[PDB]
Structure formats: C-alpha cells, structure tokens
C-alpha cells in the first residue's frame with residue numbers, strides 16, 4: 153500500500169519516524185515522508201523518498217502568529233505547551249497546500265504523523281483514510297492538543313470537526329515505567345536509533361581508558377566529546393582545540409559513554425536509555441522537560457536546576473560514581489527491548505485498511 | 507547482536523544490502539556497513555553507520571594488478587567473469603587491513619557480504635564467526651568464484667583454505683522463474699528497492715497521458731545521448747535517470763511505477779527495480795557481469811535484450827515493449843514471485859539462528 157509519513161521541523165522528528173517508515177518499505181509498501189524544506193535532506197539521507205511540506209523556514213511559524221504579529225516566547229513549562237500547540241498548528245496549516253498537491257497524484261491509503269504533525273490528521277481527514285499518530289519521543293504526544301485544536305479551528309470546522317480527531321491508532325514508544333497513568337491506549341513499539349550517519353572513525357566506537365562524557369545540544373577523571381552540527385563544530389574547534397566536536401552518530405557513540413549530557417532532547421534521551429547509559433538533563437527551554445523529569449524520577453537520570461559548569465559537574469560525578477543510575481538505565485533499556493518490533497507494528501497499519 | 511555488512515565498489519552493492527541491514531537495525535541489532543571510501547556517503551545516506559574498507563576507488567582494483575601494472579578490460583562475455591573475479595579479488599585483499607582494525611574494536615557476531623564481497627568471507631573466517639552471502643542481483647552469486655579463488659590464493663592459504671569457504675547461509679533474491687537449475691539451497695528473500703533519494707517533484711510520481719520510457723546508464727562514474735535520440739520518433743515521454751554530476755538523479759523506486767519501459771545498460775539492481783514494479787525493460791548491454799542474467803529476463807519474456815549497437819534497434823524494441831502486452835504480463839508475473847518471497851524482516855530471524 154501507499155503510506156505517507158509526516159515529520160516536522162527538526163531532524164529528531166525524521167529520525168523518530170524512520171524505523172517504522174523503513175519497516176513499512178521493507179515489507180513492500182511504498183513510503184513517502186514529508187517535512188519542511190530544510191528537513192528534506194534528512195529524510196533523503198534516511199533512505200526515504202522525501203517531499204517538502206512547505207518552503208518556509210520554521211522560524212516563520214515559531215516567531216509569528218497567523219496574522220504576522222510577534223509571538224511572546226514561553227517562560228514556563230505550561231506556557232511552552234500552549235506555545236508549541238500554536239506554532240506546530242501554524243506549521244500544519246502551512247503544510248496543507250503542498251500535501252494536497254502530492255496526494256492528488258500519489259494517493260496514500262494511510263497517513264502516519266509524529267506527536268505534533270497535525271497536518272497528518274488534517275490530510276487524512278480530507279482524504280478519508282486512517283490517521284495513525286506515532287509518539288516521536290517519551291513525552292505525552294497529546295500534551296499540546298488543546299492549543300493545536302484552537303489554532304486549527306478554521307481548518308477543523310471546514311472538515312466538520314470540533315477539535316483534533318482521535319487517531320485511528322496511537323503508536324507509543326514510551327517504556328511502561330515512564331508512561332503516565334492517563335496515557336491513552338496504544339499499540340506499543342520498540343524504538344530503535346535511526347539518526348544521521350557519517351564515516352566512522354575508531355574513537356567513535358572504541359571505549360577509552362577513562363570514562364567518557366558525551367555533551368550534545370541536539371575536574372572529573374573523564375573525556376568530553378561534543379556532539380553538535382558540523383557547521384557549528386568548525387567555529388567551536390577554534391575556541392576548544394583539543395576536544396572532539398562534530399556530528400557523531402549517537403547510536404554509535406553512546407554505548408561507549410558513561411554519561412550523556414543534553415538539553416532535554418527527546419530522541420537523545422531515548423538513545424541513552426536504549427543503550428543503558430545514565431543521562432544529565434540541563435533544561436534549555438522546550439516541552440520535553442517533563443519527560444526528562446520522569447526519567448530522573450525513575451532514577452535513570454539527573455535533571456539539574458541551573459545551567460552552570462558547576463551544577464553539571466556535580467551531577468556528572470553522581471551519574472558515574474553511584475551505580476544505581478546505570479542500573480535504572482539498563483532497566484529502561486530492557487523495557488524498550490521487550491516492546492513490539494517496528495516490523496510487527498507494520499501489521500497494525502495494514503490491519504487499518506484491510 | 508553486532509552485524510557487519512560488506513558492500514563493494516558501486517552504489518548498487520550498497521542499495522542491494524540496505525534492506526536486510528535496516529531490517530536488522532529495526533530488530534535491535536547494531537549494524538555497521540563497509541565499502542570503499544567513495545561508497546561511504548551512499549552507506550551513510552541509506553541511514554547505516556559507514557566504515558571505509560579502503561581509501562582506493564574501485565577503478566584502482568579494476569585497472570591495475572596487485573603490483574600496480576595495468577590490466578586491460580575484457581573483450582568477451584567469457585573474459586568478463588574472469589576479469590571480475592580478479593578485480594573483486596583484489597578489492598577484497600585490499601580491504602583486509604581496514605576490516606581487521608575495525609573488528610579489533612567493534613567485534614561482529616556475524617558477517618553479511620554481497621555476491622562478490624569476498625572480504626566478508628575472509629574476515630568472518632579470521633574472526634571465527636558465521637559468514638552469510640546475500641545475492642545482490644538476480645545473477646548467479648557464485649559466477650566469479652573460480653577466478654576470485656585464484657586471485658585470493660595467498661589469503662585463503664593463510665586461513666588454511668584451498669578455495670573460498672562456503673557461506674553458513676546463502677540468502678537469495680532471485681525469483682523462482684529466473685533461478686538456474688544448478689542453484690544451491692538458499693534462504694529466499696523478497697528484494698525491496700533502497701536506492702539513493704532526493705526531494706521529489708510531481709513529475710517523478712505522476713504519469714502523463716502518453717507512455718513513459720525511462721533511460722538510464724546506472725550509478726558508476728555519451729551512449730545515453732544516443733538512446734534519447736532514438737526515442738525521438740515514438741510518441742512517448744522520455745525521462746533520463748543519471749548522476750547529478752529532465753536529467754539527473756531520480757529515485758528509481760519512485761519513478762519506475764510510472765513507466766511503461768525501463769531502458770538500461772545491464773545493471774542488476776535496475777533490472778530488479780523494473781521487474782519488482784512489473785515494468786517491461788530494454789537491456790542494452792555495456793559489458794559488465796550481469797549480461798547473461800539479463801538474458802534470462804529476456805528468455806522469460808519480461809524484457810528484450812538488444813543484440814548489438816544498431817541504429818533504430820532500441821527504437822523498434824521500445825515499440826514492441828509498449829504495444830505487445832505479453833512483456834508487461836511476464837514482468838507482472840516476476841513482480842508477484844518477488845512479493846511472495848520471505849520479508850527482510852523474516853530473514854533477520856535466520857541470521858539470528860546462526861549465532862543464537
């Protein structure tokens with residue numbers, strides 16, 4: 153069958169959907185994936201046919217409302233949910249023209265969107281085909297829905313709907329230990345890494361003679377490796393000469409790490425958990441703060457109060473030196489390993505149209 | 507488990523192995539794929555961790571012996587198999603130092619090589635882990651083995667072997683109607699397309715009103731220009747699939763379903779793409795080791811192989827493939843055979859059975 157996948161504005165949204173997308177293609181299905189023009193290369197380099205949902209940069213959707221007025225940046229977790237609901241909503245509305253043009257000529261039998269790819273809901277409803285929503289991290293996929301329904305109220309009304317429709321199937325990748333009690337029924341799925349890849353160098357997959365701390369933005373007897381965009385790493389290399397910096401495929405390097413330090417990146421969190429590696433979360437905005445708190449409260453992470461070289465250092469020492477954090481992290485890895493494989497989940501997609 | 511895949515010197519070899527490699531990764535395994543430095547970007551852009559087996563291009567192994575002395579190109583179909591055995595043999599030998607260094611730090615539990623990725627056989631033997639050979643086109647995977655075994659004598663003797671070791675498992679993608687009688691036992695697999703991708707434009711996945719003929723010469727870095735000039739008589743839309751460095755790289759998996767004929771140079775994976783989508787094909791052989799396998803597709807009735815370089819030969823063959831329904835009927839028959847074969851996902855379980 154023909155399946156349209158809809159990712160969003162960031163590479164993690166392509167990566168999180170890639171396992172199920174490639175699983176469907178491996179099962180003989182014809183698969184297209186959509187994302188903003190800037191994300192198209194990430195779809196293509198995941199080996200997936202790529203369509204642009206819009207030729208506008210995401211900042212257009214983030215920093216201004218449907219009228220063109222400035223959007224006040226969120227100062228709190230609660231403000232962040234409403235903020236995210238609205239701008240993902242705006243990006244979804246701006247995605248519809250391109251998606252109609254694609255689907256008039258290549259008609260999908262099913263549409264799969266990520267957590268906040270609301271254009272998938274709209275295009276499926278327009279076409280009269282099942283809408284599948286896949287969680288693209290361990291955070292609640294539905295957490296921005298109220299704001300998103302408001303943002304898309306015009307489009308939803310045109311479809312005879314009062315709010316965002318419930319999906320025909322919710323595919324969740326959140327380990328049972330981390331799922332909140334109010335989580336809606338899901339077809340569970342084992343997450344696997346499918347991040348951007350590079351030519352591998354030995355340091356990436358070889359464990360060193362000292363503990364290794366990976367730092368990414370998406371005192372201690374240890375080495376620090378910086379996982380960042382290559383474009384950024386060039387300038388970073390001048391200011392910090394003797395430190396590994398550049399895009400390093402996280403699935404490859406994380407098994408060599410004692411700690412993964414990140415900004416609250418959902419997919420980085422999954423990579424660390426999956427590998428059984430303790431993680432340090434340093435809040436840098438975003439709505440994944442809450443999902444990070446759950447990992448910390450489970451005992452497989454520490455979330456620090458302040459973004460400080462000082463506060464981070466103490467936490468790193470704790471994650472390395474107290475065996476419990478790695479213990480809980482391996483526990484989460486095992487929970488992930490016990491979930492239904494993407495190959496099996498393709499069967500649930502087939503069942504929706506047969 | 508850890509699984510090392512070994513591709514070769516051309517993009518088609520990466521693409522052919524990418525379905526099983528990604529099925530393995532989708533199943534929780536840690537998967538690395540090796541190939542010559544020039545192929546590393548193709549591995550990376552298939553979403554697979556990529557290691558270089560050598561820093562030399564495939565042209566190096568093709569055009570020179572081990573001492574650097576020039577070797578001529580084959581002139582006959584018979585010379586092709588022998589010549590290919592030797593250069594694949596040389597490339598395998600030149601891959602061993604890089605593979606030894608990778609596997610000392612990332613030790614695979616299992617090694618998967620394509621049809622003529624002989625370094626996979628060699629490294630698996632060195633490591634004492636199972637070696638799996640996966641056919642990377644519908645041609646006989648073993649067709650260059652005698653010549654490769656001669657080329658690899660020193661390496662094989664070092665391992666206490668007289669010839670290339672048999673795989674622990676052979677994984678075949680050749681549909682039944684095209685398998686020769688002498689074919690060995692195999693775990694069958696449904697081939698799926700996994701070619702390089704680009705941003706799609708409507709013309710790639712929308713067919714027009716008139717028939718559509720795709721022309722290609724493959725993905726290895728003239729004769730394309732003549733093929734299009736032949737098409738000029740027929741009332742057909744012509745699409746040219748070629749390297750970027752319409753005209754350009756167009757993902758074959760996407761556009762072939764909109765075509766009525768695929769015209770190509772005798773490339774194994776292009777043939778598979780056409781057959782898989784049920785599309786008749788015109789094979790215009792430009793050397794290589796797939797020639798006779800293309801003839802099988804010809805003999806079955808799902809293609810025509812143009813005997814030689816003749817003006818209007820391509821044109822008349824195209825006309826016959828468009829207006830005689832039998833070619834597409836046979837092509838759809840091959841498509842159905844492929845679709846009945848075990849999924850890459852099922853094949854991962856057979857790989858697992860080799861180490862579990």
Ligand SMILES: Cc1cn([C@H]2C[C@H](O)[C@@H](COP(=O)(O)OP(=O)(O)O)O2)c(=O)[nH]c1=O
Nearest residue numbers: 164347370379380399400402417418419420
């Ligand atoms: C920076 C970087 C990211 N990645 C991948 C890992 C994750 O799949 C993804 C990051 O997603 P995520 O952690 O959600 O961060 P953000 O959305 O803020 O970018 O990118 C690498 O593989 N290597 C790298 O060097």
Ligand SMILES: Cc1cn([C@H]2C[C@H](O)[C@@H](COP(=O)(O)OP(=O)(O)O)O2)c(=O)[nH]c1=O
Nearest residue numbers: 518701724725747755756758773774775776
């Ligand atoms: C030139 C070109 C190649 N390809 C892909 C299709 C096949 O998987 C592969 C060609 O492989 P193949 O036909 O075996 O020929 P060769 O070994 O000479 O490259 O490259 C495209 O998808 N689009 C293109 O425009």
Ligand SMILES: [Mg+2]
Nearest residue numbers: 302303304305
């Ligand atoms: Mg409103």
